[PDB]
Nucleic acid binder design. Structure first.
Ligand code: MG
Ligand code: MG
Ligand code: MG
Ligand code: MG
Ligand code: MG
Ligand code: MG
Ligand code: MG
Ligand code: MG
Ligand code: ZN
Lengths: 217, 108, 152, 304, 115
RNA sequence: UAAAUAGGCUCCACGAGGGUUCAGCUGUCUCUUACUUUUAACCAGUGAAAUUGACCUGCCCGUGAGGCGGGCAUAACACAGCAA
RNA sequence: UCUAGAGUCCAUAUCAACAAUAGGGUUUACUGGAUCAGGACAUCCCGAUGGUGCAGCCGCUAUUAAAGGUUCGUUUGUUCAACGAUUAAAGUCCUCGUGAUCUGAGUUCAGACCGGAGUAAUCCAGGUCGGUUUCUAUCUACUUUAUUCCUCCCUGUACGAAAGGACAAGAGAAAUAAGGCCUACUUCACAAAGCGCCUUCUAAAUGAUAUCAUCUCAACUUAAUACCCACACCCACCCAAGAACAGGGUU
């Protein structure tokens, strides 16, 4: 029972009718392209249509580092290293240019946002472009890969050791001296996990979303 | 900076007695139709609330006298019974806080 | 600009806000009725409601136990939460607390509010009733009840 | 004296009055759905130089929508709720300008309005609207008060102008309000970072009227011109207007035909007086689309 | 955002560049009315104590959706009359240079890889 | 340095001395933005000081300027800002 | 203003010498920068027109035009100047314009050193290093009045002595300015924002004074809509509205 995050809407004040029209159009787009199931950390191959060519097809294989957005525009970022150059591309799912999306290796890592790979060593983000899929048992939980990573030394792009990121996929004991984990832990905010009123309870919403999705068949 | 001239009593009166600075007459006072005391609509009768807080304080004093010391929040409901009131059939297994004055008419 | 910010600002920062609301909530769970400044009670009402929601899940759950450990400071009250309050509201699915406004505070003339957990043993707050059903306007509306019911 | 509707009603009377007034509102709304079986007014064929009434929509939100040429185009969703023509004022009743229609939108409660407005709507047989707006139209575009207006009033392929109350930033200083390069940070700029510089020159012993200064921002009506309409949802009455539109979500905006001097024509193929769903002319599908929208359910585009 | 005073790594096999020098190439001017430079915007570089025209072919600054977001501000050296000085390009160059007008046909006839 | 009026009796060590440079770093800046705290604005209590000829205290042009002249404007009144 | 001197011929395509008629200053010897800018035109660009020796874009001068715009840096601070890269352009001046908005240098604050003058104290309209101006706003006044460039068709026609190479009309793309938004990216996360997105409207014809002629200080005929818009409520709660008051909603 996995409901892709797009259909779960941000907490706000928008009118439910907007989300109903949004979902209607989305589901009407899911029946011309199979939008597979992929978690952040998976490996995808996206096949799209070149707008600047005369009708050519473009393939790009990478790791889904971030999955954000909602509604008919939500996207995912694919990171890869080609010829030693680290590229990313932000792909919109429901765009009418993406021909297909192969889940080439369905995985799931400790953190829900693999942005720090921009700092990890180049080989923790390199993948072979021409690499074949890997099967998986249907009634099997999505594997939880455990790969802690080793960082480029000094200037991290976004200062990952802070508590507010809560990243659990980096080897801090190596690159950061014991002292630096005491100044970078005075920002802990022990009250933020126990704030009962910041919790977006989305059970009664995902239930109705499932009613809608299944009825749209 | 500093003033360049004293301000006269006339200008000061046109400022101090302007309507925006006056105290507005309140259009939402009335009389507790049963109890007969003054009150605002959206607020509790002050006299009634005081007579309730007095009894709450007396009950709580009895509760403290029975629980002994701190850190003794009971694990069962509580019921308060006034003189000549045997514990009803529904209140067995609930702590009783005896009081020694006739039950108030307003206590239902 | 403060469009769509639902959390008041009080105390010396976010943390002191959580701690103030925590003390208010602990007092509420201990005595079941407290008089506090109106805005603080209005901020604490949501937390008291969700505390009862967490307490319904019961002792055995660990997430609820950790939450009630944080949000109750004298731990004698955690039994109560899981054995007197949460059982009491096995029927109600919402609205466990009633909140009223009361005469302003004598010293600093602040806007006060009494907040209590529905169903306690204490003498009942003087709630404001509506107009008796036998008043003139209500009688005319009752006549309209009858005459509309027969037509439909 | 001072009182609200349900202060003196009794416990068992408030639900009844709520239900009764809601039922009456629904009945009155339904008893206007067919404006040709009632007494319409003359329906003239369109001719150049005429102007037709517009709509009062409600801003829902935004979405993307692509095009066969491969570009992206954000759009805004406008839901037409209870848009009824409420009043008519004649050509020389306004003393020369044009004829005018008063259109209302977004049905509102009836216990929260002034007595005069309730009297007006009672004589008109409708429940009170929230915003009433005055459209300047030619004589032949007249529509009887009491008729409804529907999102199908527009058609994709045209351009449309939208006017609404901007979002209110409150009292704002000068750089958030007028884009003023404030004074630098350290290098000693003490107690002057986000401050206006010299308000006016020195020989004049006054500040000109119309000087840019701190004060309230937004919350004023303003208009966006040239917005194109891509899609219409005739089942929920949504209009998909290109670009962004002023206002916040759930606030009423005023939509009318584009007045720019490049779309004065092409008011011809539009339904001139309005769209009446009872005309029964090849009833419109659920979604009307522009010629160049990569609508859902179609094969993924190719550039060969 | 390749603006004045930003270091760019020349990737063209750089018959001139690619040789050691204590400085690193810097952009001293962007041929757009505003300073910011995006893909295809040909800029001016101070490299090896010399001034040479350039051409941006990738930048760390996020662009539109379907175009690549590199992790290094990549530049190709171009002669004044538009001819690329180098004879090869190894780092991938985006396919978003066949778009909006400019001197890009030669720079695609000299590269070898795309994304 | 792309560009330079700047920098380039011997004599180790030292300098919160003065000048210059490499590399890094960063909201110093390109170009600002969000949040928090104090201040703030409102309610309640207590309650100053510089300053003050009188004021029923407008704008433009001229004279030599709120106050003169010639035109213009002009129902009264708080509150928060700004600094000509 | 006389052209008189030149310019391969010729004052008027250019300098145009003296002088004359005009508007404007010359103090030493025997005050910049940031911020916001108001204004004039004696116009740098954009716009319109005349002649050309531009046979043509551009050049040159001349008339008209002040709605809009008028860059970023290295060295240095009687404030300029030089230099690099650009740009359609990097305009000339008035109000240091603007220090109860902020800053720096000074010139003139006590410390010290170097050079000149002096018997000395000390001087020096010299050169270096260091160095504190505070303000709670009483009154006035005020706080919601679309341009440019590039590319491409139209093509290399006319113009043109070869050579080069036009208008009128459209279509894309970018920036800037104003106004607005938050679907995506981004900082973040019930929202506010930008680095993102959207919209922007003096040559002729007839013809008299002077019967031909003559464009006429002759008669006579030709070359912005939009936006706002409901007399009479206000206790309470909520709010995308808000400093208080106001405003929207409470079916
Ligand atoms: Mg960074
Ligand atoms: Mg406080
Ligand atoms: Mg400061
Ligand atoms: Mg020292
Ligand atoms: Mg006070
Ligand atoms: Mg004067
Ligand atoms: Mg004032
Ligand atoms: Mg931000
Ligand atoms: Zn009472």
């Amino acid at each position: 029972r996995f409901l892709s995050p797009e259909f779960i809407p941000r907490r706000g004040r928008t009118d439910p009718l907007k989300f109903q029209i949004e979902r209607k159009d989305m589901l009407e787009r899911r029946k011309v392209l199979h939008i597979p199931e992929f978690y952040v950390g998976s490996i995808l191959r996206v096949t799209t249509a070149d707008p600047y060519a005369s009708g050519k097809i473009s393939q790009f294989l990478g790791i889904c580092i971030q999955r954000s957005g909602r509604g008919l525009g939500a996207t995912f970022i694919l990171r890869n290293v080609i010829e030693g150059q680290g590229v990313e591309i932000c792909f919109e799912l429901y765009n009418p240019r993406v021909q297909e999306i192969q889940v080439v290796k369905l995985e799931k890592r400790l953190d829900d946002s693999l942005l720090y790979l921009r700092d990890a060593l180049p080989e923790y983000s390199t993948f072979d472009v021409n690499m074949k899929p890997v099967v998986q048992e249907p009634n099997q939980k999505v594997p939880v890969n455990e790969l802690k990573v080793k960082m480029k030394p000094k200037p991290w792009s976004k200062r990952w050791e802070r508590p507010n990121f809560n990243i659990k996929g980096i080897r801090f004991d190596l690159c950061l001296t014991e002292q630096q984990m005491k100044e970078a832990q005075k920002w802990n905010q022990p009250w933020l996990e126990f704030d009962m009123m910041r919790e977006y309870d989305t059970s009664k919403i995902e239930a109705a979303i499932w009613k809608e999705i299944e009825a749209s068949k | 900076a500093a003033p360049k001239n004293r301000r006269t009593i006339e200008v000061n009166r046109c400022r101090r007695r302007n309507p925006q600075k006056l105290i507005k007459v309140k259009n939402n006072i009335d009389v507790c139709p049963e109890c007969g005391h003054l009150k605002q609509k959206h607020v509790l009768c002050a006299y009634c609330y005081e007579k309730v807080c007095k009894e709450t304080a007396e009950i709580r004093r009895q509760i403290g006298k029975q629980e002994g010391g701190p850190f003794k929040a009971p694990t069962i409901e509580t019921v308060v019974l006034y003189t000549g009131e045997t514990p009803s059939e529904q209140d067995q297994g609930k702590r009783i806080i005896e009081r020694d004055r006739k039950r108030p008419s307003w206590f239902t | 600009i403060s469009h769509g910010r639902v959390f008041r600002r009080m105390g010396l920062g976010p943390e002191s806000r959580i701690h103030l609301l925590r003390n208010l909530l602990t007092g509420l769970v201990r005595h079941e009725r407290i008089e506090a400044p109106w805005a603080r009670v209005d901020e604490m009402r949501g937390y008291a409601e969700k505390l009862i929601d967490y307490g319904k899940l019961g002792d055995t759950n660990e997430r609820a136990m950790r939450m009630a450990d944080f949000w109750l400071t004298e731990k004698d009250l955690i039994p109560k939460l899981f054995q007197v309050l949460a059982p009491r509201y096995k029927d109600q699915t919402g609205g466990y607390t009633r909140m009223l406004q009361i005469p302003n505070r004598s010293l600093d003339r602040a806007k006060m509010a009494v907040i209590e957990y529905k169903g306690n043993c204490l003498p009942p707050l003087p709630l404001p009733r509506r107009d008796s059903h036998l008043t003139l306007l209500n009688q005319l509306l009752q006549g309209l009840r009858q005459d509309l019911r027969q037509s439909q | 004296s001072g009182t609200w509707w349900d202060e003196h009603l009794s416990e068992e009377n408030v639900p009844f009055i709520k239900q009764l007034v809601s039922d009456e509102d629904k009945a009155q709304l339904a008893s206007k759905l067919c404006p040709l079986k009632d007494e319409p007014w003359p329906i003239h064929p369109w001719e150049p130089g005429s102007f037709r009434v517009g709509l009062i929509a409600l801003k829902l939100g935004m979405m993307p929508l692509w095009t066969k040429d491969g570009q992206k185009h954000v759009v805004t969703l406008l839901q037409v709720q209870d848009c009824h023509v409420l009043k008519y004022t004649s050509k020389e009743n306004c003393n020369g300008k044009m004829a005018t229609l008063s259109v209302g939108g977004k049905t509102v409660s009836r216990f929260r309005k002034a007595t005069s407005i309730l009297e007006f709507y009672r004589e008109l047989g409708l429940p009170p609207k929230q915003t009433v707006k005055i459209f300047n139209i030619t004589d032949n575009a007249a529509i009887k008060p009491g008729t409804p207006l529907y999102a199908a009033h527009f058609r994709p392929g045209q351009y449309v102008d939208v006017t609404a109350k901007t979002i209110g930033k409150g009292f704002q200083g000068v750089m958030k309000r007028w884009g003023f390069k404030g004074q630098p940070a350290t290098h000693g700029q003490t107690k002057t970072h986000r401050r206006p510089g010299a308000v006016a020159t020195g020989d004049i012993g006054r500040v000109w009227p119309g000087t840019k200064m701190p004060g309230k921002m937004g919350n004023i009506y303003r208009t966006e011109y040239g917005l194109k309409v891509w899609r219409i949802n005739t089942k929920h009455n949504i209009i998909y207007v290109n670009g962004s539109v002023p206002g916040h979500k759930n606030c009423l905006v005023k939509v009318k035909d584009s007045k720019l001097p490049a779309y004065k024509d092409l008011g011809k193929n539009l339904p001139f007086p309005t769209y009446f769903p009872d005309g029964d002319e090849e009833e419109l599908p659920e979604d009307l689309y522009d010629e160049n929208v990569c609508q859902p359910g179609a094969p993924s585009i190719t550039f060969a | 955002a390749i603006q004045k005073m930003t270091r760019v790594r020349v990737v063209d096999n750089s018959a001139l560049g690619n040789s050691p020098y204590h400085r690193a190439p810097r952009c001293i001017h962007v041929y757009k009315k505003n300073g910011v430079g995006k893909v295809g915007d040909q800029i001016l570089l101070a490299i090896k104590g010399q001034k040479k025209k350039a051409l941006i072919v990738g930048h760390c600054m996020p662009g539109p959706r379907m175009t690549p977001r590199f992790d290094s501000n990549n530049v190709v050296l171009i002669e004044d009359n538009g001819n690329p000085v180098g004879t090869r390009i190894k780092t991938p160059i985006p396919t978003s240079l066949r778009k909006r007008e400019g001197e890009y046909s030669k720079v695609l006839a000299i590269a070898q890889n795309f994304v």
